[PDB]
Each structure stands twice: as C-alpha cells, then as structure tokens.
C-alpha cells in the first residue's frame, strides 16, 4: 500500500 516513489 505504501507507494514506491522511484
């Protein structure tokens, strides 16, 4: 659920 920024 946490977005992977890269």
């Amino acid at each position, epitope marked *: *659920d*946490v*977005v*992977n*920024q*890269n």
Partner: antibody
Amino acid sequence: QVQLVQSGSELKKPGASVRISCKASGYSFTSLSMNWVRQAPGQGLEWMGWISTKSGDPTYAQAFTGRFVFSLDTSVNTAYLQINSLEAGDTAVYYCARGQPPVGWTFDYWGQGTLVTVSS
Amino acid sequence: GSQSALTQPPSASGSPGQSVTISCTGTSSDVGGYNYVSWYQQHPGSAPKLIIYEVSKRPSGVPDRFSGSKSGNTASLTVSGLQAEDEADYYCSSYTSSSTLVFGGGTKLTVLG
C-alpha cells in the same frame, strides 16, 4: 560517501525564474528518488514533492503545483528545481533530499541547501 | 508550526544528562497507519540530519542516546543523556495514505545550563 551538492545562493526580483541544481555522488543516481523540501527563514520544513530518477516524472505537493518544476540530467547525476514567476513568499532555503530505499519516504541524505532570496 | 499536519510541542527543555521525550501527533492515515515516521535534527545554518527512521531505526553513526517509538497516532523521540550539542530543532515526518509526506512544525530543544 553519499553526497548531494547544491548550487549557490540566488538573489532575484519578483517575476524572475531560478533553476537550482543538486548533484548526487556516491551511489547510483537512478536507483533512488529525489525529494525537494523548502524552509522559509525562521520557519519549518515543507515537503514540495518528489521526482523518480527512473522515469523523470515529478509528483508535486498540492502547495507546489503550477510554478515549480522538478527535472533531471541523469548524464551528470543531477536533479534540478526551477521556480517560475518568483514571488516574495518564495524566499527560502530549498533542499534536495534522497529517498532512502525501499520507497523513498525517509530522507537519508540531504543537500546543503540553496538560499533563494526574492527582494520586494 | 502550530498549524502543521503533525503536531509537535514548539519547545522542549532538559538539563545535561537528563532524558527528554518529545511527541508528534498525527492520524491513523499517517503516524498511526504506517511505519514510515522519521525524525530529523537541525542545527542553525545546517541541513536537517536523519536521526530516526521507520519509527525506531537509527542510521549508522547516530548515537544510541536517540530512540523512537509510537503508540496509536503519536510518535515520540527520546534523547537520553542530554548533551549541550543536542540543542537544536527536531522535526518529525510521516508518509500518508494520500501518497504524500507530512511534517511536524518542529520542536526547539533547549539544554538548560
């Protein structure tokens, strides 16, 4: 070691543009995201958004949509921030900050900051 | 600072050698929802420095006098064995379910005497 070295201080008038750089060394530049954080003199930290160093695609915080542009030159391991149509309230130190693996939401290494001063 | 998304006390104080704890209150969509709470230390004229990440982890080189925890929607930084050089501003941050980062307003930690 990991190091993020930013460009020098800027002194500008309202309406002008400025492009700040952040040159990354000591790790693979395109492996991790870059975040931008602003701090007005005497005030707290403000998250501006991030850029993916894989895609080049920027995502802006709501307060930083419109006049602010994140970009890259991956051939020289550099992230850039441009501010267009400068206003007095843009006076601040602007930091680049590396997104720590895995997801980039912890800022493990910071540039030294670039002061942008807008004289009114 | 008092209007920030995460709430920190504007000031905190301790004496040399004392332990002090400072809090960072968010919501179940950020501090209470994820384990991406960070703490940054900032001395005058210097960039922020990461001191705690993922609620309780410490970067290599950061003294073990700094520790972090959370309970519900409130994260806490503890500084034990306070030293004069710990006088600085401390900021918390968190990921949010909106795919953003929020910051606290900062706490100025004073070391009395």
